[PDB]
Design an enzyme around this catalytic site. Structure first.
Site, PDB file in Angstrom:
ATOM      1  N   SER A   9       0.740  -1.238  -0.129  1.00 49.09           N
ATOM      2  CA  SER A   9      -0.002   0.098   0.162  1.00 49.09           C
ATOM      3  C   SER A   9       0.867   1.151   0.030  1.00 49.09           C
ATOM      4  O   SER A   9       1.893   1.174   0.363  1.00 49.09           O
ATOM      5  CB  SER A   9      -0.966  -0.112   1.246  1.00 49.09           C
ATOM      6  N   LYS A 222      12.757  -2.102  24.180  1.00 46.11           N
ATOM      7  CA  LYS A 222      11.599  -1.543  23.845  1.00 46.11           C
ATOM      8  C   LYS A 222      11.605  -0.036  23.700  1.00 46.11           C
ATOM      9  O   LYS A 222      12.271   0.852  24.478  1.00 46.11           O
ATOM     10  CB  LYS A 222      10.685  -2.134  24.799  1.00 46.11           C
ATOM     11  N   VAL A 223      10.581   0.502  23.269  1.00 49.69           N
ATOM     12  CA  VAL A 223      10.216   2.003  23.135  1.00 49.69           C
ATOM     13  C   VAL A 223       8.871   2.107  23.466  1.00 49.69           C
ATOM     14  O   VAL A 223       8.006   1.558  22.996  1.00 49.69           O
ATOM     15  CB  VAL A 223      10.656   2.444  21.777  1.00 49.69           C
ATOM     16  N   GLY A 229       3.803   0.962  11.079  1.00 48.12           N
ATOM     17  CA  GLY A 229       4.997   0.952   9.851  1.00 48.12           C
ATOM     18  C   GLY A 229       6.255   0.020  10.274  1.00 48.12           C
ATOM     19  O   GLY A 229       6.687  -0.339   9.155  1.00 48.12           O
ATOM     20  N   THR A 230       6.593   0.022  11.311  1.00 52.62           N
ATOM     21  CA  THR A 230       7.621  -0.949  11.740  1.00 52.62           C
ATOM     22  C   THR A 230       7.683  -2.185  11.200  1.00 52.62           C
ATOM     23  O   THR A 230       8.556  -2.840  10.960  1.00 52.62           O
ATOM     24  CB  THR A 230       7.880  -0.997  13.286  1.00 52.62           C
ATOM     25  N   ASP A 232       6.584  -3.170   8.105  1.00 52.80           N
ATOM     26  CA  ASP A 232       7.229  -2.943   6.810  1.00 52.80           C
ATOM     27  C   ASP A 232       8.623  -2.617   6.821  1.00 52.80           C
ATOM     28  O   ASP A 232       9.193  -3.223   5.954  1.00 52.80           O
ATOM     29  CB  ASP A 232       6.173  -1.728   6.163  1.00 52.80           C
TER      30      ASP A 232
HETATM   31  N1  ACP Z   1       7.371  -0.103  20.631  1.00 53.42           N
HETATM   32  C1  ACP Z   1       8.334  -0.665  20.183  1.00 53.42           C
HETATM   33  N2  ACP Z   1       9.757  -0.788  20.793  1.00 53.42           N
HETATM   34  C2  ACP Z   1      10.733  -1.460  20.274  1.00 53.42           C
HETATM   35  N3  ACP Z   1      10.826  -1.930  19.328  1.00 53.42           N
HETATM   36  C3  ACP Z   1       9.478  -1.931  18.277  1.00 53.42           C
HETATM   37  C4  ACP Z   1       8.238  -1.243  18.885  1.00 53.42           C
HETATM   38  N4  ACP Z   1       7.660  -1.412  17.799  1.00 53.42           N
HETATM   39  C5  ACP Z   1       8.145  -1.900  16.965  1.00 53.42           C
HETATM   40  N5  ACP Z   1       9.380  -2.084  17.097  1.00 53.42           N
HETATM   41  C6  ACP Z   1      10.276  -3.015  16.196  1.00 53.42           C
HETATM   42  O1  ACP Z   1       9.841  -3.218  15.100  1.00 53.42           O
HETATM   43  C7  ACP Z   1      10.088  -4.860  14.585  1.00 53.42           C
HETATM   44  C8  ACP Z   1       8.683  -5.504  14.396  1.00 53.42           C
HETATM   45  O2  ACP Z   1       7.679  -4.968  15.383  1.00 53.42           O
HETATM   46  P1  ACP Z   1       6.583  -5.963  15.865  1.00 53.42           P
HETATM   47  O3  ACP Z   1       7.136  -7.354  15.821  1.00 53.42           O
HETATM   48  O4  ACP Z   1       5.789  -5.153  16.664  1.00 53.42           O
HETATM   49  O5  ACP Z   1       5.729  -5.799  14.188  1.00 53.42           O
HETATM   50  P2  ACP Z   1       4.289  -6.078  13.921  1.00 53.42           P
HETATM   51  O6  ACP Z   1       4.643  -7.508  12.916  1.00 53.42           O
HETATM   52  O7  ACP Z   1       3.487  -6.436  14.854  1.00 53.42           O
HETATM   53  C9  ACP Z   1       3.980  -4.789  12.915  1.00 53.42           C
HETATM   54  P3  ACP Z   1       2.891  -3.972  12.889  1.00 53.42           P
HETATM   55  O8  ACP Z   1       2.002  -4.123  13.869  1.00 53.42           O
HETATM   56  O9  ACP Z   1       3.469  -2.621  12.779  1.00 53.42           O
HETATM   57  O10 ACP Z   1       2.061  -4.265  11.510  1.00 53.42           O
HETATM   58  C10 ACP Z   1      10.830  -5.183  15.752  1.00 53.42           C
HETATM   59  O11 ACP Z   1      12.157  -5.238  15.261  1.00 53.42           O
HETATM   60  C11 ACP Z   1      10.817  -4.192  16.760  1.00 53.42           C
HETATM   61  O12 ACP Z   1      12.062  -4.077  17.311  1.00 53.42           O
HETATM   62  C1  PXM Z   2      -3.177   1.628   4.631  1.00 57.89           C
HETATM   63  C2  PXM Z   2      -2.012   0.833   5.340  1.00 57.89           C
HETATM   64  N1  PXM Z   2      -1.152  -0.060   4.853  1.00 57.89           N
HETATM   65  C3  PXM Z   2      -0.261  -0.582   5.582  1.00 57.89           C
HETATM   66  C4  PXM Z   2      -0.265  -0.869   7.066  1.00 57.89           C
HETATM   67  C5  PXM Z   2       0.516  -1.519   7.858  1.00 57.89           C
HETATM   68  O1  PXM Z   2       1.328  -2.283   7.096  1.00 57.89           O
HETATM   69  C6  PXM Z   2      -1.417   0.171   7.566  1.00 57.89           C
HETATM   70  C7  PXM Z   2      -1.476   0.410   9.217  1.00 57.89           C
HETATM   71  N2  PXM Z   2      -2.553  -0.883   9.344  1.00 57.89           N
HETATM   72  C8  PXM Z   2      -2.298   0.797   6.951  1.00 57.89           C
HETATM   73  O2  PXM Z   2      -3.262   1.533   7.262  1.00 57.89           O
END
Ligand code: ACP
Ligand code: PXM
Ligand code: ACP
Ligand code: PXM
Ligand code: K
Ligand code: K
Ligand code: ZN
Ligand code: ZN
Lengths: 309, 309
Positions: A9, A222-223, A229-230, A232
């Site tokens: 996207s 952690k943060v 976006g993380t 992606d």
């Molecule tokens: N609040 C946070 N604190 C520390 N690292 C974070 C973070 N949010 C994301 N990250 C980092 O992002 C990467 C992937 O994050 P996570 O496993 O939460 O993603 P996710 O698959 O749930 C993605 P999303 O929910 O954004 O689609 C990890 O390498 C992690 O370190």
């Molecule tokens: C349009 C859109 N694309 C990608 C993502 C996450 O990869 C989000 C957040 N859900 C989103 O709103």
């Protein structure tokens, strides 16, 4: 010679989906061909959002395009968040034709389905997708990066210990992907609730038909914030770095995470620096400071350590 | 603090439109919000091409998007090739509202209408556009970069000499834009047919209401090939560099051109290196080697010299 077909996207503003995987993969020299599966003004995390989506036919129209001009030959194919079941299907047909086109085609897939929290998880995409990823998509991917939740869903098995984890990753490998990285878990890291544990596992073929399996564990600091976006940005860079170290799920992940850190830390700051003394940062202020972090995306200061097995 | 609202076309593969203005403006630190006016597989120069276009309503839907979330505030707004008259209109309304939103809003506009050659020119966009650019669009732009042809069309006056040129640029300034750069001319450069002459002219307001007008001339070494996208890459970088040198249409253009050179030269090469000994490079091989040229886009080795007046 680094071509990637990133189907994701796009947002006019902000960094999510293709906007989060392109800039990186470019500053690190990958020729990125990007197909916007949707074009919205901002990610759906904002109060409002307006935009359009590309349907299965439309996506097709473009594939053909590259066909008619004999330029439908890529090295890597990268996909992530999709909401349409039918759309995802299409995407498989493509990756398929595309693999016969190039054997060494690596399909990097982030099986985006939902988030969890001690069990209180739930998909944020239609459930009619779990079947496709499990049955159609994952079988053809060569590098997946699921949540603890997401991996639990695909395997149909809940993770309680680290050992159970490694065993859930094995069930994955036995699904197709020779690379599996659970980007983050609820498992308490041997360094306190302050950190985040992630798990990686790569399957290599031995010169005698046997089995070789490296495994790792990186604990990231952690943060305290909700970042969109993380998921992606991670998949992108992992794809980048696992190209330089084709056989070091350890070396790669180290760089991949380190930068993720640099980005997030500079992000949270500039973000916090715009609501100082008493206010929670808005999602409009938490957007990823990508441009500002180019310096790190390329020269990541490894500030983490992968632990084997 | 560098936000640009680039409204241009997007291609899955290749570099034309937004794909040619984003990467640059990013490696040079500009936070680029990109609205894809169309999404095609490749530029229309290829044998085939499949894709979709965004209509006036759709473009609107997105503007609003950024509105509802109070993030419709940019520094620069960049536009280029458009085929729909109605679409371009919309784009003006926007730039307008957007200027009241921020006084110091610079609207960088490349009045794309067509190419020429000694007189044998003709528009490659509907003629119903000339009126809008001349009457609606150009009046609000603050930095235009037209062809010799395009400038001739807007002014309605044909250029024969260098002096007539400078006088056609003055007619432009008297239309609105304080910056006008005729990116290339048919005028024989004082260094032979081997080169390409370009002309720049900036209007500054004197502290006593008077007039100050810098003027320049850069001769760039020509490259024997048909390149699609250079129009876009130029406008981008010019916008970049004219931000660092807010008052040196001379210093800027120097950097802007130099890089254009580096890109084109590395492009033509890799392009030629894929058809060596007897074949004309295809448009699929002439695509701009953007990624590969990042090194230059940021640290342009000034290999040209601006000549004042
Ligand atoms: N609040 C946070 N604190 C520390 N690292 C974070 C973070 N949010 C994301 N990250 C980092 O992002 C990467 C992937 O994050 P996570 O496993 O939460 O993603 P996710 O698959 O749930 C993605 P999303 O929910 O954004 O689609 C990890 O390498 C992690 O370190
Ligand atoms: C349009 C859109 N694309 C990608 C993502 C996450 O990869 C989000 C957040 N859900 C989103 O709103
Ligand atoms: N064949 C060539 N040789 C040298 N420079 C070239 C070139 N083609 C393009 N350029 C460079 O591109 C810039 C703008 O090119 P030009 O004036 O031809 O664009 P244009 O407005 O006709 C754009 P287009 O036709 O691509 O939309 C100039 O700075 C010029 O140096
Ligand atoms: C779709 C598209 N966009 C932009 C351009 C030039 O700026 C071209 C080439 N005419 C094109 O085909
Ligand atoms: K993930
Ligand atoms: K031009
Ligand atoms: Zn995710
Ligand atoms: Zn042009």
């Amino acid at each position: 010679e680094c071509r990637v077909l990133s189907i994701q996207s796009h947002v006019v503003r902000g960094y999510v989906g293709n906007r989060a995987a392109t800039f990186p993969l470019q500053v690190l020299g990958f020729e990125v061909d990007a197909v916007n599966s949707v074009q919205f003004s901002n990610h759906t995390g904002y109060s409002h959002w307006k935009g359009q989506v590309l349907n299965s036919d439309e996506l097709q129209e473009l594939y053909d395009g590259l066909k008619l001009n004999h330029v439908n030959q890529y090295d890597y194919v990268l996909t992530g968040y999709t909401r349409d079941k039918s759309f995802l299907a299409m995407v498989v047909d493509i990756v398929q034709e595309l693999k016969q086109q190039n054997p060494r085609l690596v399909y990097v897939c982030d099986p985006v389905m939902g988030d969890q929290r001690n069990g209180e998880g739930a998909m944020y995409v239609p459930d009619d997708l779990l079947p496709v990823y499990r049955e159609k998509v994952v079988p053809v991917a060569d590098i997946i990066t699921p949540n603890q939740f997401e991996a639990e869903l695909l395997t149909g098995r809940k993770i309680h210990s680290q050992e159970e984890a490694l065993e859930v990753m094995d069930m994955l490998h036995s699904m197709g992907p020779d690379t599996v990285v659970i980007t983050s878990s609820n498992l308490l890291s041997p360094r306190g609730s302050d950190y985040l544990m992630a798990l990686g596992s790569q399957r290599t073929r031995a010169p005698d038909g046997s089995v070789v399996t490296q495994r790792i564990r990186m604990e990231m600091h952690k943060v305290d914030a909700v970042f969109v976006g993380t998921g992606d940005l991670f998949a992108a860079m992992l794809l980048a770095w696992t190209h330089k170290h084709p056989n070091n799920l350890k070396v790669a992940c180290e760089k991949t995470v380190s930068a993720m850190h640099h980005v997030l830390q500079r992000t949270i700051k500039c973000a916090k620096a715009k609501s100082g003394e008493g206010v929670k940062p808005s999602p409009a202020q938490l957007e990823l400071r990508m441009v500002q972090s180019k310096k790190d995306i390329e020269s990541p200061e490894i500030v983490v350590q992968a632990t084997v097995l």
